[PDB]
Amino acid sequence: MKELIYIEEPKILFAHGQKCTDARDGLALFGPLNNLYGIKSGVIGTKQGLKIFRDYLDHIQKPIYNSNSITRPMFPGFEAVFDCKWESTGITFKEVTNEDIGKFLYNSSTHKRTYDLVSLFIDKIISANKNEDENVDVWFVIVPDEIYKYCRPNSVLPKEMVQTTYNYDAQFHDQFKARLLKHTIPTQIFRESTLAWRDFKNAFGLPIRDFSKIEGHLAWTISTAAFYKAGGKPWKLSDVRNGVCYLGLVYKKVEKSKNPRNACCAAQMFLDNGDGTVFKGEVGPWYNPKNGQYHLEPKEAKALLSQSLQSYKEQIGEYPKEVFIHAKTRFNHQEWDAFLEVTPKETNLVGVTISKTKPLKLYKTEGDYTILRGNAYVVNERSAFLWTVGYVPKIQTALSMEVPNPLFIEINKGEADIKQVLKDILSLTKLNYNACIFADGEPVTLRFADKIGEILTASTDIKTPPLAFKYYI
Amino acid sequence: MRNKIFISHATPDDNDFTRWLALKLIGLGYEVWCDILFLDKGVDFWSNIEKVIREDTCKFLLVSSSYSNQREGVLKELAVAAKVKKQLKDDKFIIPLAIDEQLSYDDINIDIVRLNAIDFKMSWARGLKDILEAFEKQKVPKEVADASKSNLLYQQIFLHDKSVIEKEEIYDSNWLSILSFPEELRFHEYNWMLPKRFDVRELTFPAVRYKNYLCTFAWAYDFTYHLPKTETYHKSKTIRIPTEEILSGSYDSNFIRNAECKRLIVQLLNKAFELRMKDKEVQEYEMSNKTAYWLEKGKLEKDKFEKTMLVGKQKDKNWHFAISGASKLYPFPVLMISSHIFFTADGKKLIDSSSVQHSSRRRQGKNWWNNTWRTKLLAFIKYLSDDDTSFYLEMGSEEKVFVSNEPVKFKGNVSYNI
DNA sequence: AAAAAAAAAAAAAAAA
RNA sequence: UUUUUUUUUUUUUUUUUU
Ligand SMILES: NC(=O)c1ccc[n+](C2OC(COP(=O)([O-])OP(=O)(O)OC[C@H]3O[C@H](n4cnc5c(N)ncnc54)[C@H](O)[C@@H]3O)C(O)C2O)c1
């Protein structure tokens, strides 16, 4: 037989120094790290669509019960969880008439219609930000479903409903959050179906997006995102050592310019003088020509890693003692030679590659349940298989539906001991501030890096983008 | 002295609010007694409740809800609380907490109908603030607030019944160990004998052209039929290599490199798997990159191997279990197998629409858990067996590779229970 | 124009 | 785009051989 060693589930710290493996359970009992007095929310959308948002906000003011509390914890209400005040009273509402959205949406050109629809919302948001006295913490952008289902690529407008730009991305969300980057306005896009879906029904009459049993989790993952965007700390990691910066590189394709040009983006995590965690993006997007390189040539590699090290020195004082450059692609020697040069003598630079491609799947002998989450099949000192997706007993179910696929972790460069590499990625899979779940399937460096790349490659006019995730997730 | 707070409620219905309130109050420093708190029960709890109410309780909180309104145990506890209130000469003893909106104040219990209640119906936090303020006003006994007590109690009782436990479990993977390889990899000097504009994928045994050397594990004259010119080839022109050294990694040279000699084995093994599937007379569904093989409706006796069904019906769509095999030499010599589900409308011809195929695959895999994947995968593998313990893939008239029909079993020292 | 061993973009379903 | 997960589609590149 071949041994598989299990890594203890990481604990995330909450208010009053309390630790808990689960984010929802720990947050519902101990509260968040910082005190947000209240969320002055701004609302933009149809006047008809404002009613749905008001109803949902009044709903989440009250406790919400899900089908099986053991599988997923119930929601005790926004104020009970967060100690932060959020009513439907005090929302600044900017009206978007149905005629306005019908003016642009019913167009033959998809890119033109998407650009106009994004401009329609962003102009009102900017006007409210600049020329209105009312202060709003976060702008909830309610979008209808006709716009949603015909404002993304590959959406063919039917001929009977066509009534009547190309430098940008045809995706509403990406372009939307890209064009607001210069103004630094935290926003949260909502579909009318994500909101009170019960009105929207299919042909059979049932809701299309039935969230009847998952209502509590929906409230959990909306309230946490709203709290994060307003400047609140939901939770933090506890087992991360001092002097360890991580950084995660993801390469995205850029189609607006001729040749994909393969922009590179990064997300950075470390600790502070004290105990505070810093999870901020570190993006200066360094474009890489050639169609399928995905390998960053030495000048921009030096730029990326020098920015990463300086952003750590500026906040802690001295250089990280071990940088764990995680990435979803393998490293050829060209980056690492450049990377070594900028790094000092004391810093131990490590490049770790994480992949889901490898087709290994563990099927347990008996029982209708999948492998326990935390098992690591260590192939050797440099490579290993880790099951970040799987069963954890507290949530009563697996994180996946079928038998989950493990993460292929290989220490491509540097030396690093494999146990610590496997013990930090599992820890990283818990800081997904975009969702209030038990744990993530992939480390949040490679996830928030992917998101920040998908947002920063939609607009070419961006310059010195914000590094806070409020403006990205 | 009386320094404990009693919380009456309906046990099978109001666990969520009672749990939240108790775990909050304990963290705030208030001694709390509740039936959901203590883990395990015995016959003694009936007298325990009465003695606690009559001798230790300082405040009696009644969770008022449509369930707890007319619950016999709740009513008995409320009556004992009323008697204790009369005895103690303290009017502000029972503090009802209404948490249900469908329970109007005009339909609450007679023992409560006269009592001012704290409103939890709209916001729980406002109700908790009211509870705390009433407790400081009435000077309820209190200790210094310590959330760690609530954390300890939560870990001890509630994250407690479902925890990591140590007990060894064996796991079944989708990796099939390879028992043996031929002794040597043969580099035939065919040259002009094999036509330059010829395809090696139609030739009988696996063979890939490298430089001017046909890379295969077969014997030199195994390839006479498709290559009639190869009748007069000299066997001394082969550069046969000790394959075991290649797997170890010792061999490397200008002629061939371990990186480029081990990538030529997996192509041979992959084509050999394809040829074995063709020999097994199982059909194929072409995917984006890989070719997967599924079994017809009727080839197996009653469309099932062993006691496990591999072909079934879903309305008019006959779902077919499929596998795909790929060889990787990096970790171990392994022929990995993947699980795939494909659908047919008549049991013989595949549906060409990708959208309906994907939708049907998702709908059918909706309810297939671990045991429904492992069982079918091992059943298909056992159906592919040549013997009781292993099956061979043909790489020559005399050369074969034995691949186990038993997937690589791993071992874990941690597991759990349903 | 093939091969494997590595790559990202995109859409559809189903639970959490 | 509240999420997360699992597939199916294409495409592409590199190292190499003619
Ligand atoms: N604060 C209280 O507990 C309470 C209760 C009843 C009446 N009142 C009073 O009502 C006044 C005049 O207004 P009103 O005639 O509309 O009163 P009301 O009886 O018609 O209703 C007033 C509100 O207090 C009521 N109430 C609060 N707690 C209650 C409980 N435990 N049981 C039953 N009812 C409860 C209802 O919430 C109701 O919304 C007073 O001047 C006054 O003190 C107060």
* Largest Cα–Cα separation, chain A: 70
Burial B243-276 (b: 16+ CB within 10 A, else e): beebbeeebeeeebebeebbebbbebbbbbbbbb
Q: How far apart are CA B296 and CA B282, in angstroms?
A: 7
Structure tokens at B247: 């797997």
Nearby residues of B32 by Cβ (< 8 Å), 6 or more positions away? B4, B5, B7, B22, B25, B26
Q: How far apart are CA A314 and CA B105, in angstroms?
A: 61
Looking at the complex, does the CB of residue B154 fall below 8 Å from at least one CB of chain A?
yes
How many Cα atoms sit within 13 Å of B224 on the Cβ side? 7
Structure tokens at B111: 């023992």
Contacts of B368 in chain A (CB under 8 A): 402
The reply to whether ligand 1 has any atom less than 6 angstroms from the CB of B118 is no
CB of B412 within 8 A of CB of A364?
Answer: no
Phi, psi dihedrals of residue A149, rounded to the nearest 5°: -80, -10
**Residue from the list A362, A369, A394 with its beta carbon closest to the beta carbon of B171:** A362
DSSP string covering A300-332, please?
A: HHHHHHHHHHHHHHHHHSS--SEEEEEESSPPP
Q: How far apart are CA B184 and CA B123, in angstroms?
A: 77
Spatial CA neighbour of A425 closest among A403, A436, A441? A441
Q: Are strands A383-386 and A375-377 parallel, antiparallel or unpaired?
A: antiparallel
**Residue from the list B23, B377, B416 with its beta carbon closest to the beta carbon of A372:** B416
How many Cα atoms sit within 13 Å of A119 on the Cβ side? 13
DSSP string covering B291-348, please?
A: EEEE--SSSSGGGEETTEE-B--BTTBEEEEEEEEEEE-SSSSEEEEEEEEEEESSSS
- Which A residues 32-91 touch B at CB under 8 Å? 61-63, 65, 69, 74, 76-77, 79-80, 83
Contacts of A367 in chain B (CB under 8 A): 370-371, 418
Q: Is B284 exposed, middle or buried (0-12, 13-18, 19+ CB in 10 A)?
A: middle
* Chain position carrying tokens 């045991």: B371
Rg (alpha carbons) of chain A, rounded to whole number: 23
Task: Identify any residues that bridge with B33 across adjacent strands, giving them in sequence order.
Answer: B6
Phi, psi dihedrals of residue A335, rounded to the nearest 5°: -65, -40
Task: Identify any residues that bridge with A409 across adjacent strands, giving them in sequence order.
Answer: A354, A384
Contacts of A403 in chain B (CB under 8 A): 370, 373-374
Q: How far apart are CA A39 and CA A186, in angstroms?
A: 12
A 10 A CB-CB count for B310 gives 21
* Choice from B62, B69, B116, B130 to test ligand 1 binding pocket (greatest atom count within 8 A of CB): B116
**Residue from the list A29, A79, A374 with its beta carbon closest to the beta carbon of B23:** A29
Q: For A38, which DSSP code?
A: B
Contacts of A21 in chain B (CB under 8 A): 159
- Which B residues 255-314 touch A at CB under 8 Å? none
Nearby residues of A133 by Cβ (< 8 Å), 6 or more positions away? none
Sheet holding B57-64, edge to edge: B32-33, B4-8, B57-64, B94-98, B118-119
Instruction: For residue B10, give the 3-state DSSP assignment.
Output: coil
Residue from B410, B413, B418 to probe the interface with A (highest A Cβ count within 10 Å) = B410
Q: How far apart are CA A214 and CA B244, in angstroms?
A: 56
Looking at the complex, does the CB of residue B365 fall below 8 Å from at least one CB of chain A?
yes
Distance B105 CA to ligand 1 centre (A): 9
Strand C bases, protein C-beta under 7 A: 3-16
Q: How far apart are CA A385 and CA A410, in angstroms?
A: 9
Q: Is A48 exposed, middle or buried (0-12, 13-18, 19+ CB in 10 A)?
A: exposed
Spatial CA neighbour of B22 closest among B159, B163, B158, B161? B158
Q: How far apart are CA B176 and CA B411, in angstroms?
A: 16
Contacts of B412 in chain A (CB under 8 A): 3-4, 6, 371-372, 375
CB of A265 within 8 A of CB of A452?
Answer: yes
A 10 A CB-CB count for A323 gives 25
Q: How far apart are CA A305 and CA B191, in angstroms?
A: 52
Q: How far apart are CA A263 and CA A255, in angstroms?
A: 10
Q: How far apart are CA B10 and CA B131, in angstroms?
A: 20
How many Cα atoms sit within 13 Å of B80 on the Cβ side? 22
Task: Identify any residues that bridge with B59 across adjacent strands, giving them in sequence order.
Answer: B5
Q: In what helix (H) or strand (E) does residue B25 lie, and over which residues does it extend?
A: helix B15-28
Spatial CA neighbour of A323 closest among A431, A458, A445? A445
User: Could you identify the atom of ligand 1 that is nearest to the CA of residue B108?
Assistant: 32
Residue A426 CB in 7 A reach of strand C: no
Please tell me the total number of residues recorded for chain A in this structure: 473
A 10 A CB-CB count for A366 gives 9
CB of A370 within 8 A of CB of A404?
Answer: yes
CB of B322 within 8 A of CB of B281?
Answer: no
- Interface contact B410-A377, CB threshold 8 A: yes
CB of B178 within 8 A of CB of B393?
Answer: no
Q: In what helix (H) or strand (E) does residue A277 lie, and over which residues does it extend?
A: strand A277-281
Structure tokens at A437: 């779940």
Binding residues of B for NAD(+): 8-9, 11, 35, 46, 71, 73, 77, 105, 115-117
Q: How far apart are CA B407 and CA B385, in angstroms?
A: 12
Minimum CA distance residue for ligand 1 atom 39: B105
CB of A371 within 8 A of CB of A387?
Answer: yes
Structure tokens at B223: 């390839």
Q: How far apart are CA A202 and CA A220, in angstroms?
A: 26
Q: For B375, which DSSP code?
A: H
Phi, psi dihedrals of residue A104, rounded to the nearest 5°: -95, -40
Binding residues of B: 8-9, 11, 35, 46, 71, 73, 77, 105, 115-117
CB of A407 within 8 A of CB of A358?
Answer: no
Distance B121 CA to ligand 1 centre (A): 15
Q: In what helix (H) or strand (E) does residue A341 lie, and over which residues does it extend?
A: helix A333-342
Q: How far apart are CA A183 and CA A206, in angstroms?
A: 41
Spatial CA neighbour of B310 closest among B299, B318, B320, B301? B320
CB of B366 within 8 A of CB of A401?
Answer: yes
Distance B84 CA to ligand 1 centre (A): 26
DSSP string covering A186-245, please?
A: -EEEEETTTSSGGG-B-TTSSBTT--STTHHHHHHHHHHHHHHHTT----EESSPPTT--
A 10 A CB-CB count for A291 gives 10
Q: How far apart are CA A280 and CA B56, in angstroms?
A: 52
CB of A82 within 8 A of CB of A36?
Answer: yes
Q: How far is CA A41 from the centre of its chain?
A: 21
Instruction: For residue A270, give the 3-state DSSP assignment.
Output: strand
Phi, psi dihedrals of residue B127, rounded to the nearest 5°: -65, -40
Q: What is the sign, positive or negative, of the torsion defined by CA atoms of A285, A287, A293, A296?
A: negative
Residue type at B310? Answer: L
Q: How far apart are CA A235 and CA A228, in angstroms?
A: 10
Distance A260 CA to C16 C1' (A): 35
Q: For B221, which DSSP code?
A: G
Structure tokens at A158: 């039917």
Minimum CA distance residue for ligand 1 atom 21: B105
Q: How far apart are CA A174 and CA A254, in angstroms?
A: 13
- Please give the torsion angle defined by the CA atoms of residues B124, B129, B131 and B133, in that order, rounded to the nearest 10 degrees: -170
Binding residues of A: 434, 472-473
Burial B122-149 (b: 16+ CB within 10 A, else e): ebbbbbbebbbeebeeeebeeeeeebee
DSSP string covering A387-446, please?
A: --SSB-GGGSSBSSSSSPPPEEEEEEES---HHHHHHHHHHHTT--TT---S--SS-HHH
CB of A133 within 8 A of CB of A190?
Answer: no
CB of A24 within 8 A of CB of A73?
Answer: yes
Phi, psi dihedrals of residue A356, rounded to the nearest 5°: -105, 0
User: Could you identify the atom of ligand 1 that is nearest to the CA of residue B106?
Assistant: 33
User: Could you identify the atom of ligand 1 that is nearest to the CA of residue B116?
Assistant: 31
Structure tokens at A336: 């690492």
CB of A363 within 8 A of CB of A405?
Answer: no
CB of A86 within 8 A of CB of A222?
Answer: no
Q: In what helix (H) or strand (E) does residue A49 lie, and over which residues does it extend?
A: helix A47-61
Q: What is the sign, positive or negative, of the torsion defined by CA atoms of A107, A110, A112, A117?
A: positive
CB of A251 within 8 A of CB of A288?
Answer: yes
* Chain position carrying tokens 């303020």: B133
User: Could you identify the atom of ligand 1 that is nearest to the CA of residue B117?
Assistant: 31
Q: Are strands B165-180 and B334-344 parallel, antiparallel or unpaired?
A: antiparallel
CB of B342 within 8 A of CB of B285?
Answer: yes
Instruction: For residue B103, give the 3-state DSSP assignment.
Output: coil
**In Å, what is the CA distance from A20 to each residue of A250, B15, B25, B415?**
30, 21, 19, 21
Structure tokens at A88: 């439907």
**Residue from the list A30, A79, A369 with its beta carbon closest to the beta carbon of B418:** A369
Helices B15-28, B147-156: crossing angle, 10 deg rounding: 140
Residue from A360, A408, A438 to probe the interface with B (highest B Cβ count within 10 Å) = A360
Distance A403 CA to D6 C1' (A): 9
**Residue from the list B15, B173, B409 with its beta carbon closest to the beta carbon of A360:** B173
- Interface contact A29-B20, CB threshold 8 A: yes
How many Cα atoms sit within 13 Å of A30 on the Cβ side? 31
CB of A407 within 8 A of CB of A355?
Answer: yes
